[PDB]
Design a binder for this molecule. Structure first.
Ligand SMILES: CC(=O)N1CCC(Cc2ccc(F)cc2)CC1
Ligand SMILES: CC(=O)N1CCC(Cc2ccc(F)cc2)CC1
Ligand SMILES: [Cu+2]
Ligand SMILES: [Cu+2]
Ligand SMILES: [Cu+2]
Ligand SMILES: [Cu+2]
Lengths: 286, 287
């Protein structure tokens, strides 16, 4: 009942209402809760000793962020019942010679790249320094939003459309030991550790700035449109592989299994396996 | 009103045994680690960023946060054993003793004893000793055992007394602006222990030492829950005395500190946990 559109197919009002609603949540102090939640899960290892955490590098990577975006979208609609979370189709932006000139990086939406003159501090758009305060790992002020498109050796370019399709061809959702080293795994493949960095992981490194590391990534509002696309690819995969379900169903590390509570919530992957059941849908399904 | 919360000294041998085992079950399942993480995560959620106030401490939300914290915890106990309830450690009566480190609460059948100076004060007695109990650090990585150092600090060589508790109950205002560590004439700040600190709640932490000495790793010691159960009790008693004194601020305080503001990392508000009886439990001193 709640359509989630593509950024390029948004009206000027839809772009305006979305941005404005985010700034309100920021002013209310609700936005910082999500920044903290994301960082808090990143240090919750399942189990302690492994490199697997509640939100990343394991099987719960996809359902966690789905619930994450869901709650966020719910807080959006508590302000404006018409606003929904759009998605950034970065696989299509890769077609451009220079993706930074895309309409998603316009001054009326997310702003542009960082300014090399000003330590790559974002000085354009509604989320520039002085109009948008960011925090660091410890929860202290950091001094502005940063962005450095394709300035990394491991990720100088965005992933391609072919990368997305090759990921959808995978049969298993995930494979043991449900981590960074999982092979033939759609979860691990979409995350981006298969000959990394790729896809989701590559996009983070590509954007740079706060998006470059896990604990500070949600400081950039593009984080939510990026994962909305990640959530879409997962949704499409479920539609293709109707007979394939979430893995592991159990006996994986606690907090990674199908009926396990996902820190820091009581929500289980089962509770968020069907995005239609959650009350939203993507425009490509219509 | 149906779930009695008793005193550790008033517990049977069976009740102590059942409680301890239940804690060990939650630990093995991986549920216990959630609370350690929750506590540490709120300690770095500053309200607002820049200030010394966090979601769980050094502010007005200190008391309702831990009440909800203990509430959720007590519920996870009953998911295992529906008869087990969370006891409280009356540290004010232990202060009466010549040596508090001799309380029956520090016996091998409950919480174990003090730390071993030979092995960096690692606990080697009780059900939560090294090898029977794994602990984690700030970053969420294994730390290698529980520590305890009773009264080894200059600013907290002794536990707080009954008079400290009484004098705190004599305070009229729940809290005062700027609703933080420097609040004066505040029951919250008093009971927390920043008034000539460390005192009361804060002093107990520093007294026990080890993981209990710092905020992010404090829940690694199961005594953390019996300690805050006593802190919650004193708060409950204060509410009974001053029935028309309510939570402050009702508004205009930092977000997450107000009466109807969600307490990170939950959606629970101080209003939702203002009446402990409505939460489904009571303390034995009320009967
Ligand atoms: C490939 C690589 O080493 N990285 C490490 C950094 C990481 C960044 C990141 C940030 C937030 C997330 F929720 C997930 C991942 C991307 C993958
Ligand atoms: C007085 C003092 O400086 N402290 C700092 C250390 C702190 C310990 C502590 C641990 C966990 C809590 F939930 C609350 C408090 C007690 C107060
Ligand atoms: Cu994430
Ligand atoms: Cu991400
Ligand atoms: Cu605490
Ligand atoms: Cu405490």
């Amino acid at each position: 009942y709640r359509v989630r559109k593509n950024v390029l197919h948004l009206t000027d009002t839809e772009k305006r209402d979305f941005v404005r609603t985010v700034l309100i949540l920021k002013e209310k102090g609700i936005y910082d809760r999500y920044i903290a939640w994301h960082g808090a899960a990143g240090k919750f290892h399942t189990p302690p000793g492994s490199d697997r955490n509640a939100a990343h590098m394991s099987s719960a990577f996809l359902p966690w962020h789905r619930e994450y975006l869901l709650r966020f979208e719910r807080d959006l609609q508590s302000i404006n019942p018409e606003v929904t979370l759009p998605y950034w189709e970065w696989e299509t932006d890769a077609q451009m010679q220079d993706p930074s000139q895309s309409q998603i990086w316009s001054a009326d939406f997310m702003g542009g790249n960082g300014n090399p003159i000003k330590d790559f501090i974002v000085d354009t758009g509604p989320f520039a320094a002085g109009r948008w305060t960011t925090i660091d790992e410890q929860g202290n002020p950091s001094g502005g939003l940063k962005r450095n498109f394709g300035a990394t050796k491991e990720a100088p370019t965005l992933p391609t459309r072919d990368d997305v399709l090759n990921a959808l061809k995978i049969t298993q959702y995930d494979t043991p030991p449900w981590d960074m080293t999982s092979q033939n795994s759609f979860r691990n493949q979409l995350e981006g550790f298969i000959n990394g960095p790729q896809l989701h992981n590559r996009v983070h490194r590509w954007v740079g700035g706060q998006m470059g590391v896990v604990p500070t990534a949600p400081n950039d509002p593009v984080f939510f449109l990026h994962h909305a696309n990640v959530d879409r690819i997962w949704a499409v995969w479920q539609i293709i592989h109707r007979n394939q379900n979430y893995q592991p169903m159990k006996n994986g590390p606690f907090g990674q299994n199908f009926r396990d509570p996902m820190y820091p919530w009581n929500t289980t992957p089962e509770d968020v396996m069907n995005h239609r059941k959650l009350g939203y849908v993507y425009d490509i399904e219509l």
